[model samples]
Target: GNKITVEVTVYAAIEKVWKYWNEPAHIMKWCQASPEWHVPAAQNDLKAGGTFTTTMAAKDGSMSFDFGGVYDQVKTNDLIEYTIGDGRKVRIVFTHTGDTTNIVESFDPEETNPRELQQSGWQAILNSFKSYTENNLEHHHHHH
Candidate 1:
């Protein structure tokens, strides 16, 4: 079986990044590589045997995809595991070092398309996350 792995390094604390990743509002801002796609819903149980999902759609809701799976494992700010349409398990890990958060996701890949696409997509999303979080921090600091 083929496998795909993606990694990203964000300039933010693990807890802050984790919260944004699990929240629909913040997730929608970054999860979509294209500006036209938006996440309308995000649900997560964050525990073993629990379920999680996200639905992304066009601004008009004319197109959508539901990505979801059961949680095989979950450790706050550390790890997450789930499955997709093909019953292939996927694992995501978060590592915090100083002020940086590293997120890595790996799963069995299909042999059809180039696996590099997967990594690139994830890297793009992470860049968005970094921007969103840093900007948010700047605003909050100024306000406070």
Candidate 2:
């Protein structure tokens, strides 16, 4: 089984990047891979052995489903590894470079879709995360 990996560089500090990535409020803003799809809710218990879940759905009320998993490993601001509800494994790594952070996510390819589609879907979500996180960070700095 081949794994699909996605990466994105975010122009924000590592701490802020980690916070937004793990927090439900921010997750809902950027978890969707496409504009027509959205993540309406997300719950995360970020720790080894902890569980997390997200609700992904079509905005037009056409389709919906829950994505969830149990964490196999967690390291603050650096790494998170988990197995999804369907038993596929996923790994996310955060690397800090001066003031910026880069995220790399690799996951097992699901049988329901082509590998290319899965790669693009995950990449889109990561790209959205980068944009949303950087914009929010800028807003926070301006308000302070």
Candidate 3:
């Protein structure tokens, strides 16, 4: 029962939120868990039975790990469910009204970290995602 849940809302439409959420380029930009941390790469296969991977690394070079999982189910602009390498389950749901989008995450907590720690970690990432998505849309004329 240690499943940690974290969620956030983005000031954008569901399509924009969903696109930025799964796009590999957006993943590397928004996956910052810490100020000194960054994601080097991310690859996603956005479909049921597909797999995804992300390489998370710290600027100090003392920590790095591969975080990836297999998709159990995927619903475009609505839901995503997946299982991690260690058997942890994660479910993400999305809903939008007008220009606002709300997203939620329910995770089967891992063993190494305390529940609160895990919650905060995911919350940080969640917030980052929200901000990045909104920022990208705001820069609609900023050019890629």
Candidate 4:
């Protein structure tokens, strides 16, 4: 059974959010739950059909998870559809309707509960993105 659809609304602009999501240095700011976890390597080809992978390693340098998949769609700061572990299809639609970015992540499952844990974890990650992006907003505010 699939879990709940994780979602988060970032306060920054879509471009700021997108850039932080892709940058390694910016990612390291909030991507990890603790110092024991780390993003060792990351490669992103952000286009339709492009392949993306992020490797998170343990602090002890013992184990890691290869979060890699192909992009089904990429619309700059608008939307992103990607797969997880060859099991689920996750699509995140980013909307700039208000002063913030509304991100709704949906998954395919017949019946799924409102996953609190997944929601929290996803929110934490998104919060990290916000922290990183807002921190660097002054540095790269000219693009968008």
Candidate 5:
């Protein structure tokens, strides 16, 4: 019935979160709707007018999907707005306080899916991202 939103806070702050979010290599490690799904590849130009893509696949080898779009706006460590391939709008904002970064992201709900379903699916991806950054960044801290 309306746009759905999802959010997460990362302990690493905006700068590091921004890098991990956009870096293609890292995106593959975290972008998924669930444990059985994995992002096999991701590519992003990370700028306005640039194109981006992430390929998601199921571990059972029976399903796959493509998520991609043209960037309408991009601001490092701050904001990202893009138009999906089918014309839905998506925006992700970043902010930080006390070394934790907040990612508030909202997107137009597709007509094919119930709003509740879309919300949970997108939220799962964000939650995966939160876990990915926290665990991976912790390793970096431990190495020091």
Candidate 6:
């Protein structure tokens, strides 16, 4: 099977990036590709062999599904490896460039859609993360 890859560069510290990605609170905030879809809940064990799950749903209550997986490898603020509910493997690499962080995610492609659409869907989700992280940082800074 072919692979799907997606990358996003976030102008935030690695700690912040990792925290947002690992924590369920932030996951629920930016896990979807668009405003009409949202992750209402999420859980991450954050360790090799540990499991994670997220509830993704449409706001109109027309569609929903659970995305869950087990982590095969975990490297703090550096890498995460996991398998999807359907057993497809995925890896995400995080790199820091001074104050900014870049995340590259690659996964085994599913057969139901064109590769480009899969790539774009993942990219859009990552973009949502970038926007959510940056905006949250600004809000926190303003409070202190």
TM-score of each: 0.71, 0.76, 0.77, 0.67, 0.76, 0.77
- Residue-wise lDDT of candidate 2 within 62-126, one digit each (tens)? 99888777888778776778887677767777786676677887788857778887777677666
lDDT of 5 at 118: 71
List per-prediction Cα lDDT, in the order shown: 0.70, 0.74, 0.74, 0.69, 0.73, 0.74
Across 11-112, the per-residue lDDT of candidate 1 in tens digits comes to: 767777678777666655556768778766676666788877787789777787888778766778767777676777777877866766778877665678
Candidate 6 deviant stretches above 4 angstroms: 128-144
Task: Measure candidate 4: CA RMSD.
Answer: 5.9
Q: Is candidate 1 or candidate 4 better by TM-score?
A: 1
Tens digit of lDDT per residue, candidate 4, span 1-144? Answer: 364565566677777778877776665555566787877666677678888767788989888787888777677766777766657767777777787777787655534555565656666666765565567655655555
Model 6 lDDT, residue 134, Cα: 62
RMSD of each: 4.8, 4.8, 5.4, 5.9, 4.5, 4.9
Predicted candidate 3 versus true structure: per-residue lDDT over 7-78, tens digit per residue: 676776677657877778866765665778877677888888988887788889798888888887777776
How does candidate 2 fare on TM-score? Answer: 0.76
Report residue 82 deviation for candidate 3 (angstroms). 1.5
What's model 6's overall lDDT? 0.74
